[PDB]
Amino acid sequence: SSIPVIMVISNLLALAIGRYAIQNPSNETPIIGLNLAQLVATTSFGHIIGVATILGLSNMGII
Amino acid sequence: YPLNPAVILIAIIGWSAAAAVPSNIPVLGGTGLTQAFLASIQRLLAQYPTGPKLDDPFWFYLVVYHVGLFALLIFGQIGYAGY
Amino acid sequence: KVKVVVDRDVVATSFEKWAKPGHFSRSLAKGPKTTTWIWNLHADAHDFDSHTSSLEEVSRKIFSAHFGQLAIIFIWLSGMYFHGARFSNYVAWLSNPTGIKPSAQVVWPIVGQQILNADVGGGIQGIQITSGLFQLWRASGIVNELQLYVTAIGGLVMAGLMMFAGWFHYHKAAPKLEWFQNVESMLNHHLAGLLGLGSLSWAGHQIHVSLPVNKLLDAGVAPSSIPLPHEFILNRNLMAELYPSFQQGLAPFFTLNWKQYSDILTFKGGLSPVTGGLWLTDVAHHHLAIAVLFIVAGHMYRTNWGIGHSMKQLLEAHKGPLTGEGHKGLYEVLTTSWHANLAINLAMLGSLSIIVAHHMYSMPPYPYLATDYPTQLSLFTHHMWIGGFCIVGAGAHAAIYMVRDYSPTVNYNNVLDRMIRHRDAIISHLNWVCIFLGTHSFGLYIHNDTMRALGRAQDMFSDTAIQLQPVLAQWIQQIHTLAPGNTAVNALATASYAFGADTVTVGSKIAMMPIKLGTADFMVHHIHAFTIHVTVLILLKGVLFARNSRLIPDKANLGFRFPCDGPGRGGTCQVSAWDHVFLGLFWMYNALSVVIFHFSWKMQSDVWGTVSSNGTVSHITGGNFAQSAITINGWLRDFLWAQASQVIQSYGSSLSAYGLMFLGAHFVWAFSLMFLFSGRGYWQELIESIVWAHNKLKVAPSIAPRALSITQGRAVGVAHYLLGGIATTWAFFLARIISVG
Amino acid sequence: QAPSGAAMPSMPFLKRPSKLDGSLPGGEGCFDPLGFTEVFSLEWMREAEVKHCRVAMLAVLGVIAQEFGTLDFYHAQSKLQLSPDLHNQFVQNGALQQVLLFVCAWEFFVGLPALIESLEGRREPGYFGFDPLKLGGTYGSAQWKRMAAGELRNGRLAMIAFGGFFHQQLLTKQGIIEQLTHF
Amino acid sequence: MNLKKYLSTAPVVATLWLFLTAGILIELNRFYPDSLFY
Amino acid sequence: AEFDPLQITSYLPISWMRESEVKHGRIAMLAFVGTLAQQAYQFPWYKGAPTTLVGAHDHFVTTALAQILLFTSAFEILAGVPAAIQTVRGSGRLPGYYGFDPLGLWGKDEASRKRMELAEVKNGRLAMIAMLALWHQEALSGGMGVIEQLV
Ligand code: CLA
Ligand code: CLA
Numbered sequence A: 001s002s003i004p005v006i007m008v009i010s011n012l013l014a015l016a017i018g019r020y021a022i023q024n025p026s027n028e029t030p031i032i033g034l035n036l037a038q039l040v041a042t043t044s045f046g047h048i049i050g051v052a053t054i055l056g057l058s059n060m061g062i063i
Numbered sequence B: 001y002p003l004n005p006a007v008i009l010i011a012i013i014g015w016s017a018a019a020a021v022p023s024n025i026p027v028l029g030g031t032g033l034t035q036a037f038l039a040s041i042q043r044l045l046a047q048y049p050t051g052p053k054l055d056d057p058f059w060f061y062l063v064v065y066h067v068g069l070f071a072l073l074i075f076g077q078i079g080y081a082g083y
Numbered sequence C: 001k002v003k004v005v006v007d008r009d010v011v012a013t014s015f016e017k018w019a020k021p022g023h024f025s026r027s028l029a030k031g032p033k034t035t036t037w038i039w040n041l042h043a044d045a046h047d048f049d050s051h052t053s054s055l056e057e058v059s060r061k062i063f064s065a066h067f068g069q070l071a072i073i074f075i076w077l078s079g080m081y082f083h084g085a086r087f088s089n090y091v092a093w094l095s096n097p098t099g100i101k102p103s104a105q106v107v108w109p110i111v112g113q114q115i116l117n118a119d120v121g122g123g124i125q126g127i128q129i130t131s132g133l134f135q136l137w138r139a140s141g142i143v144n145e146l147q148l149y150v151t152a153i154g155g156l157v158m159a160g161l162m163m164f165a166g167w168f169h170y171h172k173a174a175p176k177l178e179w180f181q182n183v184e185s186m187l188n189h190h191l192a193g194l195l196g197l198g199s200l201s202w203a204g205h206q207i208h209v210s211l212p213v214n215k216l217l218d219a220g221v222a223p224s225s226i227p228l229p230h231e232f233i234l235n236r237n238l239m240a241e242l243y244p245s246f247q248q249g250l251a252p253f254f255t256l257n258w259k260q261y262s263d264i265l266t267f268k269g270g271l272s273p274v275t276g277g278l279w280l281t282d283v284a285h286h287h288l289a290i291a292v293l294f295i296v297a298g299h300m301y302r303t304n305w306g307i308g309h310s311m312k313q314l315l316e317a318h319k320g321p322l323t324g325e326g327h328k329g330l331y332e333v334l335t336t337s338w339h340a341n342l343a344i345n346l347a348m349l350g351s352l353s354i355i356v357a358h359h360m361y362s363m364p365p366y367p368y369l370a371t372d373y374p375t376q377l378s379l380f381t382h383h384m385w386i387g388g389f390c391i392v393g394a395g396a397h398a399a400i401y402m403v404r405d406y407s408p409t410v411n412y413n414n415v416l417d418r419m420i421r422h423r424d425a426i427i428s429h430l431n432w433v434c435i436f437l438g439t440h441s442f443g444l445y446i447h448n449d450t451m452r453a454l455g456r457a458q459d460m461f462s463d464t465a466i467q468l469q470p471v472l473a474q475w476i477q478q479i480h481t482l483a484p485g486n487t488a489v490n491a492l493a494t495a496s497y498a499f500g501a502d503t504v505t506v507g508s509k510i511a512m513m514p515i516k517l518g519t520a521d522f523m524v525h526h527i528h529a530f531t532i533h534v535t536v537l538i539l540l541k542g543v544l545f546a547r548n549s550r551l552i553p554d555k556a557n558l559g560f561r562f563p564c565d566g567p568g569r570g571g572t573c574q575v576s577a578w579d580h581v582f583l584g585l586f587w588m589y590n591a592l593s594v595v596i597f598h599f600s601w602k603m604q605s606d607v608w609g610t611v612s613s614n615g616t617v618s619h620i621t622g623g624n625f626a627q628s629a630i631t632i633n634g635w636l637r638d639f640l641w642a643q644a645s646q647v648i649q650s651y652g653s654s655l656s657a658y659g660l661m662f663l664g665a666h667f668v669w670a671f672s673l674m675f676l677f678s679g680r681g682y683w684q685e686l687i688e689s690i691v692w693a694h695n696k697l698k699v700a701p702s703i704a705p706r707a708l709s710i711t712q713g714r715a716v717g718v719a720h721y722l723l724g725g726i727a728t729t730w731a732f733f734l735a736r737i738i739s740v741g
Numbered sequence D: 001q002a003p004s005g006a007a008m009p010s011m012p013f014l015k016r017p018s019k020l021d022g023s024l025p026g027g028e029g030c031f032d033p034l035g036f037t038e039v040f041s042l043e044w045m046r047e048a049e050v051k052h053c054r055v056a057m058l059a060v061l062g063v064i065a066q067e068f069g070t071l072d073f074y075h076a077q078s079k080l081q082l083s084p085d086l087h088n089q090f091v092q093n094g095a096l097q098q099v100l101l102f103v104c105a106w107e108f109f110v111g112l113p114a115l116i117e118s119l120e121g122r123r124e125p126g127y128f129g130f131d132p133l134k135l136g137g138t139y140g141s142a143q144w145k146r147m148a149a150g151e152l153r154n155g156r157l158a159m160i161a162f163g164g165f166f167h168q169q170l171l172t173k174q175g176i177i178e179q180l181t182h183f
Numbered sequence E: 001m002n003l004k005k006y007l008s009t010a011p012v013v014a015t016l017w018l019f020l021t022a023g024i025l026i027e028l029n030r031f032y033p034d035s036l037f038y
Numbered sequence F: 001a002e003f004d005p006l007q008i009t010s011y012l013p014i015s016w017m018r019e020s021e022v023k024h025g026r027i028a029m030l031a032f033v034g035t036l037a038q039q040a041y042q043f044p045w046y047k048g049a050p051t052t053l054v055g056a057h058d059h060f061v062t063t064a065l066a067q068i069l070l071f072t073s074a075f076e077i078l079a080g081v082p083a084a085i086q087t088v089r090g091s092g093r094l095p096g097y098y099g100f101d102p103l104g105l106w107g108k109d110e111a112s113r114k115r116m117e118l119a120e121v122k123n124g125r126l127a128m129i130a131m132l133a134l135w136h137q138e139a140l141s142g143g144m145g146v147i148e149q150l151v
């Protein structure tokens, strides 16, 4: 149950980080305001952060 | 180079507080790095003439502290000088 | 921005130019009037940036030549697999790894050379091999000759494909300069695609083939009775018996329940007590962890989608107040000069070969490698030599960059310019450090020889007199011994038994054990520090003074490779960057000779040997390193004299080829001195008298005989010196270790 | 819809190979999807195809003929013609050693000169002008092209057929005629 | 004709001639081994 | 493109995408009537087969699907790859065109052809959606058939 929640947050944070982090964001996408290339880039970062955090808390017996 | 010796004041408190976090257990204690390092000098200056052996973990608490302190104070110089 | 752009049908496939020796050079195309032309043809054949001024045409030759190199490597590998399949005791060796000597070369019966077909076991007679191919193939899960044959055929098909691709990318579809200058793309692909997917796909082989085959081999199952690799993939129950995690399948990977793969992916450290090799579950996990790192790393650089770093922006950003314009220009340098890139790449690949040598002996990665002492000694020594040659090459290409490709405009107040502007400070300090290191390292041996000769053992630098304990190395050994469960909490055992903890034996033979460092080890380490600092002095001096000195203010105009600027200014022999490389080779030879001698003796004295039923370690040379390796006389007597016994007594045995090659290599070494000590002026004058005799008998050639160029004399000299010197050690080492190991 | 210019007859979606114009006897399809003819000599490839055709055709008929009946003095223990067992026997007999000699003789003294002539462009690939009975007619006629097209179509079929022969015999351990009769 | 010119180049003819020479000497020692005198 | 909110056409070329969509659709369309066929009728050769999207796949993986893979891969290597590469490089071929029309069902003029071209895609898309739904439904009904799904 905790795995999907952390992963969505990590993807949503990476998406929010991405709006400021990425050099020249799109702002031609209905709600997220990133192009597909940038969406894949941020979600990729959100996955790496998500997997690493999840494995961090699993190793510490928190989840 | 602005210098400002207050870089050394931040370098001590900045590293020491970060290094004073409680660790797991072995060859450290669980207290931290500083709490182990400041405990290691306390029981070594108690026997001021007779210095430490290679077996003693003081040498590890020394290197990992200083290699952390020198890192935090060098990156302290660049930050203050080059805003 | 990142695009494929090629020129089509750019060079016709014709034998025309094959029949025109030296077509590639305006100077050589006219053909020979003297024998100098014949040497020049060969010396210049691959100097592509001398043939043409077009960076595009140079780049295209390089890319195509690279395919030629891979084609040859594939023929060589194919050969090794085919010799394994057809002429080896590999299959028999799998059933008795400790008893049978690996052999994959059989000589024909002619002029009595069949004596070299040694009694190696496994129902063949042949040369004992030291390449470690059997240990590699066993780690890969190869159990039969069909698997080796198919790999050999596969190799020939890859060789063919490399040849086609080399031909194709030169003659049919040659990429444009802008293709090659895609360094960001190249690095993303090489990091994520070559290293990342290489390691991922290899980890795949290990988990699916190596792991199950080696687990059954290590349990003692007959290699013929082991299921073929595909049966582990097809039947999951077969795999689930060996590694229960395979019951849960790939569900634990996608759900991040990765601890479920604790059976197949481990952090055991240490070695198999069965094979004396690294646990393959450690290696599979290593390769998975590395693969991820590399695939992630290869997303760093901007290509076609905005995201990623500009290497230009990164370099130009790394600017501080002490280093002027910092790394400004270096992006232009490295995108416009092949030599600049070859300089870096040889330095790192060479340095890597040396790291590989150290890591592979101490953390023996292959099963039954550790206790195959011939293979351990051979692999360490080989990878040391390849590393040494590459590092000297880095010097050569760094200096070629400085002469041919360097511009002051590109390198204006950047780290390269600023280095040139204090070359006197750099070289004076390094010179000093070389004299400090040489006196205080080699001086300790001479002090010791003198004190021992004068009957003053209590005045020596030794473990029993004036001790020089390598306390920092000793302290680091302790930390690495205390690591497992402490600073490496999930590691069950040390990275290496070299640092401390247990003695690992396979049969009676020592695989690895703690390598204790004392006064002898402190002393030889300062010799290594010394020989490396001097080699750096020679090669770095070559680079920083490649273009000019106070002696030769226009040296760049004379070029990379030229003999001198004449006997004036007191004499200017060997001022060229090329001549620094020439001198660098001897010192590299000196440096690495002492490294492999240090290795051979230390391992024989203090590591390798037998452990009895009682459990007492008997080393090959019974711990003589500590008291003998602190004098030159001890090296001469207890190492060279004592250990040469095997190679010089080899006549009339299967090791007689080593005896012959030992003498042959001494001959070639000595022959080299004729070239190094003499000058072509003598030789050209001698040839004049010989030419007279031919003229007298109307048998003088139209291609006028010339003495070798001054530079070729040096090139021939150092090539025979290195061939002779290295091959001598090779024969010494192999005869010694195949006999006593 | 199709591609813009000339399309490959055999594969109407793929563009026609530059060298294959449909004029060759058994190459109306211009069948080269992987584009071998784009990089390799057509005269070489044609020589190879026609050589394989003629070797395969003799070999397919050889298997069938040897299955039906073998000579007495050739004590053939194996009834499987494309088995290692039979091949090995007639290497040791010296039968395949003898035909190797005259095949090697042909290839070195005839086949290699013939190939070099074709690469120079002074010989049509496969032409040895061998027609004693004149079942082709005059060299270059519509009758010759029909037989030339027939040779390849018969040869290509035998080439593939020999694959079926070898592989089926390797699984079943039965004769090609024995397999047809018994399931 | 250009391939034949290449095969007539010093190193190719030297390689082939010394191969042939080595073959003759090797084959003579295979069939007449240990010839210390005529 | 009409409906492309992510703007995938901006990154991969429409010719390549429209090859993929039409390829997917044709596979999905045979797969949908294939699933209804196998769940209804069984061949005499197999007899004792699961007749479930997951079970039938797992059953026929070593034999039937291995042969399908071999001859499906063959087509993709020889026809599918050069077709897909020639379209993007600019041959002028419509994506999906393999010249397969033994009958005259495409139509005449352009209007009737583009309607039949649109028909293929929209029949492909509905079969594409269908095949995703059938896997979800079979998974979360304890391995229930597509006809057995209707109580
Ligand atoms: C198959 C036939 C073929 C033919 C007819 C040609 C023809 C040509 N090539 Mg091409 N080429 C080919 C294949 C071919 N190439 C292949 C397979 C490659 C990939 C390696 C190339 C890559 C290539 C490059 C990079 C270049 C050419 C060039 C040329 C031209 C000059 C070649 C020359 O003088 O070489 C004669 C040289 C040799 C016969 C030596 C070849 C050495 C081989 C590769 C390695 C030998 C192995 C090993 C080191 C041997 C050690 C033995 C031991 C005794 C020490 C000529 C038009 C050059 C040019 O300038 O064109 C304008 C040029 O720069 N070719
Ligand atoms: C995934 C992408 C990829 C991979 C795997 C490689 C791999 C390689 N490149 Mg690089 N390259 C790439 C992308 C890639 N490149 C791109 C995009 C560019 C332009 C920016 C370049 C530009 C470039 C140049 C200019 C040069 C290279 C060279 C090399 C070789 C370096 C020597 C070596 O390590 O041999 C390792 C050898 C092997 C692993 C065996 C051969 C592997 C072959 C080529 C196939 C590998 C990929 C293939 C998809 C595998 C299929 C797997 C199969 C199970 C289906 C190596 C084969 C050098 C070279 O030697 O060229 C000939 C070289 O000079 N590359």
Ligand code: CLA
Residues within 6 Å of the ligand: C430, C431, C432, C434, C435, C436, C437, C438, C439, C442, C443, C446, C534, C537, C538, C583, C584, C586, C587
């Ligand atoms: C045994 C052979 C030998 C020896 C002793 C030397 C010595 C030296 N070489 Mg040379 N070299 C050699 C072979 C040798 N080389 C060969 C064969 C080549 C051709 C490839 C070269 C080419 C070469 C190059 C290109 C360079 C060197 C350099 C050096 C110097 C290195 C720095 C140093 O350690 O100085 C200290 C001296 C020693 C280590 C020698 C003995 C020291 C003794 C044991 C201690 C002092 C004794 C005391 C003062 C004696 C008093 C007695 C008296 C009162 C009677 C050193 C002087 C480099 C250099 O100059 O570095 C700065 C340098 O760049 N050499």
Ligand code: CLA
Residues within 6 Å of the ligand: D010, D020, D024, D025, D026, D027, D028, D029, D030, D031, D032, D035, D036, D037, D042, D045, D046, D047, D048, D049, D052, D156, D157, D159, D160, F070, F074
């Ligand atoms: C065995 C050797 C062989 C060779 C050298 C050729 C050569 C040729 N063929 Mg022929 N062909 C062959 C067998 C061969 N063919 C067979 C068995 C058939 C029946 C299917 C055909 C049917 C055919 C047609 C209809 C046509 C040709 C044509 C040609 C010519 C142009 C195409 C080309 O370059 O092919 C080069 C071929 C090769 C180099 C051999 C294939 C090599 C691959 C790598 C083998 C393995 C591929 C793969 C694993 C196969 C299975 C995959 C999957 C389907 C299971 C060329 C002279 C064209 C022509 O112009 O005729 C005059 C033409 O229209 N071929």
Ligand SMILES: CC1=C(C/C=C(\C)CCC[C@H](C)CCC[C@H](C)CCCC(C)C)C(=O)c2ccccc2C1=O
Residues within 6 Å of the ligand: C674, C675, C676, C678, C679, C680, C681, C683, C684, C706, C707, C708, C709, C710, C712, C713, C714, E014
């Ligand atoms: C010995 C020596 C020579 C003399 C060596 C020469 C000229 C090289 C000898 C050439 C060898 C023998 C090869 C020539 C062989 C021919 C190609 C013929 C081959 C015949 C068959 C084997 C095919 C120098 O010219 C020289 C120059 C500068 C510094 C030192 C020296 C030096 O030490």
Ligand code: SF4
Residues within 6 Å of the ligand: C563, C564, C565, C566, C567, C568, C571, C572, C573, C574, C679, C710
């Ligand atoms: S001795 Fe030789 S290298 Fe030295 S100056 Fe004279 S010619 Fe030049």
